[PDB]
């Protein structure tokens, strides 16, 4: 009903492109982009909106004079006339204005720090039905005003920017109980053994195996649940509510065409009943939607979740590498109300890095493959600055800790370093980078060389 600090919300409009409610939600990228863009929510039945790069945390809601006083150096409820510290839920960065242009307008994006008036956002409602100083609730559209630039959060044409004109902004809650299935969570799947997807050098990894061993702990066994319910998508999971399913590691979607097989496909193939899956307590064919965070229905380690597609009514079981291929059977065995275990935060964080890692380098490799032609002279599709920006971030992401750290903290930073090296090993991303060393060892400085001017420093 109400909005406090540490809530999970999104920002959305429907940009009217020739009488079309273009349902665009705000999405910064992070770890490879300091800029922001939009994600379509219009064709959510067939084109799945991403969510994890779109949610936000209201870290604080202070007044004006208190913020200016603290700038000289509980769960507080939202009030119109307060400056808030918005924070990207995935990247951990804070939403701020940027000093670039895409007019005296300004760009928006994330940043590392939190000081300065860039990351601060005072709120004003553009509706006479409510007024200043009172509480902000669900469905309260507003104008969000910058503090540094003193501009409004402008939506342009498609430019999310900071200009001297205003645009309304819908706010929809996502979430607000430990040991329970929460929407958007990343989780393992206990089988004996666990559900797994095959390793790299691909198949295009599109098959499905059941396996125990070290790859249960390791990268490929990661699953982020997503519902079709756009608002309140971080609510507590109950039985029979609809799920899509995106694979975390490969960046694909677990789709089902019972005509062919269990499919591992992209966004646009993942339609409604291509992948509408649910969970049941028994294996029989016996709510629908709640405007809240709901009740905690399913536990983690003590749970019997029977997977079933809505569109075909089948029940997933193994067949008879350990290749017990999970196929949507009509009945299956009694080993299909499986058990769960969630993963942790930096585990999910690196996993979300990896599928954003490969989509740069594959455009970097094929960008070089287009320049591997004797005469192409038109392949502009070759990232440079997005490579270098993501490169220092990954350099920073594996930065060893200093000697000016307490030893208990330094182990945890070291233990964070070890696991994050281990996931890149059993993804074999070194070999992905190793191919970029091949395709950049051609010249001594290249191409039309003005864009490729940092060809020395990129290689170092």
């Amino acid at each position: 009903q109400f909005l406090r600090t540490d809530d999970e919300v999104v920002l959305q409009c429907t940009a009217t492109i020739h009488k079309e409610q273009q349902k665009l939600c705000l999405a910064a990228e992070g770890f490879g982009n300091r800029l922001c863009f939009l994600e379509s929510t219009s064709n959510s039945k067939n084109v799945p909106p991403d969510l994890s790069i779109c949610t936000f945390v209201l870290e604080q809601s202070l007044s004006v004079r208190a913020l200016q006083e603290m700038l000289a150096n509980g769960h507080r409820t939202l009030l119109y006339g307060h400056a808030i510290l918005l924070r990207h839920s995935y990247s951990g960065m804070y939403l701020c204005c940027l000093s670039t242009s895409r007019k005296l307008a300004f760009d928006v994006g994330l940043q590392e720090d939190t000081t300065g008036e860039a990351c601060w956002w005072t709120i004003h409602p553009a509706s006479k039905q409510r007024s200043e100083g009172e509480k902000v609730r669900v469905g309260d559209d507003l104008i969000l005003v910058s503090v540094s630039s003193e501009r409004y959060l402008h939506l342009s044409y498609l430019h999310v920017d900071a200009a001297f004109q205003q645009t309304l902004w819908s706010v929809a809650p996502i979430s607000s109980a430990q040991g329970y299935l929460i929407g958007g969570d990343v989780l393992r799947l206990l089988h004996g053994e666990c559900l797994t997807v095959p390793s790299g050098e691909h198949e295009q990894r599109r098959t499905v195996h059941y396996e125990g061993g070290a790859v249960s702990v390791h990268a490929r066994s990661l699953w982020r649940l997503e519902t079709l319910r756009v608002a309140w998508s971080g609510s507590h999971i109950r039985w029979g509510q609809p799920f899509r399913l995106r694979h975390v590691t490969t960046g694909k979607y677990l789709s089902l065409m019972e005509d062919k097989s269990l499919l591992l496909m992209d966004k646009e193939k993942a339609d409604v009943k291509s992948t509408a899956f649910t969970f049941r307590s028994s294996k029989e064919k016996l709510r629908k939607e709640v405007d809240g965070m709901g009740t905690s229905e399913i536990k983690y380690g003590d749970s019997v979740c029977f997977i079933q597609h809505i569109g075909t009514g089948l029940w997933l079981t193994y067949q008879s590498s350990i290749q017990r291929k999970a196929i949507m059977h009509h009945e299956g065995h009694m080993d299909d109300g499986l058990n769960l275990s969630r993963s942790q935060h930096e585990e999910s964080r690196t996993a979300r890095v990896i599928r954003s890692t490969v989509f740069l380098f594959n455009r970097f490799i094929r960008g070089l493959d287009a320049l591997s032609k004797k005469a192409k002279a038109s392949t502009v599709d070759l990232p440079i600055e997005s490579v270098s920006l993501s490169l220092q971030d990954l350099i920073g992401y594996f930065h060893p800790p200093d000697e000016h750290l307490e030893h208990e903290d330094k182990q945890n930073r070291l233990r964070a370093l070890k696991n994050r090296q281990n996931l890149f090993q059993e993804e074999g991303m070194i070999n992905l980078v190793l191919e970029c060393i091949d395709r950049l060892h051609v010249y001594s400085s290249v191409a039309g060389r003005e864009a490729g001017e940092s060809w020395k420093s990129i290689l170092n």
Partner: peptide
């Protein structure tokens, strides 16, 4: 009086130095 009018002049817009020389001949 200075701050209040220029905050209004974000809300309303009104090449500037480009068309300035265009008035020198026209």
């Amino acid at each position: 009086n200075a701050n209040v009018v220029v905050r209004l002049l974000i809300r309303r817009p009104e090449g500037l130095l480009a068309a300035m020389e265009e008035a020198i001949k026209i």
